[PDB]
Amino acid sequence: FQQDKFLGRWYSAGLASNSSWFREKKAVLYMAKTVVAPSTEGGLNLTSTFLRKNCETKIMVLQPAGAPGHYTYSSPHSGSIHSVSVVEANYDEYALLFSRGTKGPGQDFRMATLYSRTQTLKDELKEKFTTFSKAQGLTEEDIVFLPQPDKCIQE
Incomplete structure (x- = not known):
């Protein structure tokens, strides 16, 4: 994993979870644009622009977790810490x-996230994502392919 190659513009295209938060705000989520650039500690700053209640921006800091491609994140929409890992990547795709x-x-969730360099997603990718999610104890009702906002991601 070469962190430098993973900088720049990404689109969140897939999301699979079992969290309470996701088990509700699911239908409401669209594809978001995330620009990745270095963080203070040598980690990653994720600046995302997203559609919320017909346009918002937040920055999440991924702190380095002791190995390349491994990070931690604080409290997102909930109040916990996250251990984030790169399962597989092609920096250009x-x-x-x-x-x-x-x-x-007895209170552990998992979240699978699929980022893409383009807004369109090939079936092969959807399948890989489907597979990974189902191996991690998630089913179809957990897997969601984020809709392309016709607004808050280009402008």
Whole structure:
């Protein structure tokens, strides 16, 4: 994993989870544009522009986790820490991320995220994503391919 090659513009195209938050705000989520650039500690700054209630921007800081392609993230839409890993990536096409956390014994969710350099997604990729998600205890009702906002991602 060459972190430098993973900088620049990405589109979030796939999301698979079992979190409470996702189990509800699911239908409401669209594809977001995420620009990746270095963080202070040698990690990654993720600046995303997304559609929320018909246009917003937030920055998430991925702190380095001791090995290349491994990171941690603080409290997103919930209040926990996330262990993020790059399952597989082609810096010119896509990246399959896996995030895991736990609010405590018997309280552990998983989140699979598929980022893409383009807004269109090839079936082969959808399948890879489908497969990974199903190996991690997620089913179809968990897997969602984010809609292309006809707005808050180009402008």
